[PDB]
């Protein structure tokens, strides 16, 4: 093996998995590691374009290698929690509010 003298092209066989839809996972699309849902994209790419971005420098749309289709990325729904409560001298019950 010859190392640290040239660009590397003899890479190992990296395996591939099956499709997934509408359920956010820790995907890895050709080295692009991220977390977010996988939905059908209404956008239209160009044949030399791999993955998209936006204003906020975040990944929004990715193209799988196994298909000429493109899959959008939207992060899993995060949100703070709040506790509606009266005084504990009055009652012990609470109400949960999701923001």
């Amino acid at each position: 093996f010859e190392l640290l003298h040239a660009p590397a092209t003899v890479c190992g066989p990296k395996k591939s998995t099956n499709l997934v839809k509408n359920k956010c996972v820790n995907f890895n699309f050709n080295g692009l590691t991220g977390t977010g849902v996988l939905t059908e994209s209404n956008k239209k790419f160009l044949p030399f374009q791999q993955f998209g971005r936006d204003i906020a420098d975040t990944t929004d749309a990715v193209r799988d290698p196994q298909t000429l289709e493109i899959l959008d990325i939207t992060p899993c729904s995060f949100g703070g929690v709040s506790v509606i409560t009266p005084g504990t001298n009055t009652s012990n019950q609470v109400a949960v509010l999701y923001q």
Partner: peptide, 21 residues
């Protein structure tokens, strides 16, 4: 009011924006 309508029409991760009360 029409003036309020005109004024409203003219005026145009992990970070969360709360709604006003």
């Amino acid at each position: 009011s029409p003036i309020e309508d005109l004024l409203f029409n003219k005026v145009t991760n992990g970070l969360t924006v709360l709604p006003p009360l």
